[PDB]
């Protein structure tokens, strides 16, 4: 049921996986890159996969129109059961737009528990679909960018790409 394909990007090769029920995971394989827009190794596939490739292409190469591309349905165990992690990931996906940032504290409050900023930071580690669900937009209230599953360099690259003065 699970299908996979790869896609070159400014952050290196990306491995995409999913099925008819939804996108399962977006994995960063090499942190090398390329600035020239590239197509997926294997075209077509489950609808969620095609929507993901279209979304990522727009994110990197036609950002001015990113809000116009639909986020595919997601199919991963983290989204199949109720948990604080799911609450946090879904709120992040729904609320934070391109170019905007939110603090660990603000996201915790949005998720119903203002004192759980540490757990929010921990929840970011469980995001199976980076970039798409913008965990890179969750930063420190001090102004510091904060930790990132893909490394500080990549988080800074993404934030700079979105207009921040970094």
The side-by-side arrangement of strands in the sheet containing 3-7 is 3-7, 14-19, 22-28
Give catalytic status of residue 52 as yes or no: no
| Paired tokens of 112 | 């119903």
Q: Map residue 18 onto helix, strand or coil.
A: strand
Consult the annotation and say whether 61 binds a ligand. no
Would the annotation count 104 as a binding residue?
A: yes
Q: Is 118 annotated as a binding residue?
A: yes
Q: Which of 135, 139, 145, 159 is catalytic?
A: 135
How far is 148 from 80, CA to CA, in rounded Å? Answer: 24
127 is in an annotated binding site: no
24 is in an annotated binding site: yes
130: its two tokens: 């980076």
113 annotated as a binding-site residue:
yes
| Residue 81 annotated in ligand binding | no
CA distance 127 to 137: 13
Taking residue 117's Cβ as centre, other Cβ atoms within 10 Å add up to: 19
Q: Any known ligand binding at 5?
A: no
Q: Which residues are catalytic?
A: 135
Binding-site residue set for DNA? 85, 104-105, 113, 118, 141
Binding-site residue set? 19, 24, 75, 85, 104-105, 113, 118, 141
Binding-site residue set for Zn(2+)? 19, 24, 75
């Amino acid at each position: 049921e699970m299908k996979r394909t790869t896609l070159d990007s400014p952050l290196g090769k990306l491995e995409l996986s999913g099925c008819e029920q939804g996108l399962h995971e977006i994995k960063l394989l090499g942190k090398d890159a390329v600035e020239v827009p590239a197509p997926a190794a294997v075209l077509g596939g489950p609808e969620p996969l095609m929507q993901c490739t279209a979304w990522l292409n727009a994110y990197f190469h036609q950002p001015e129109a990113i809000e116009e591309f639909p986020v595919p349905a997601l199919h991963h165990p983290v989204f199949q059961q109720e948990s604080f992690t799911r609450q946090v990931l879904w709120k992040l996906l729904k609320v934070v737009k391109f170019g905007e940032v939110i603090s660990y504290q603000q996201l915790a409050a949005l998720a119903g528990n203002p004192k759980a900023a540490r757990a929010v930071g921990g929840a970011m580690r469980g995001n199976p679909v980076p970039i798409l669900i913008p965990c890179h937009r969750v930063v420190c209230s001090s102004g510091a960018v904060g930790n990132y599953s893909g490394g500080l360099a990549v988080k800074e690259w993404l934030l700079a790409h979105e207009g921040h003065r970094l």
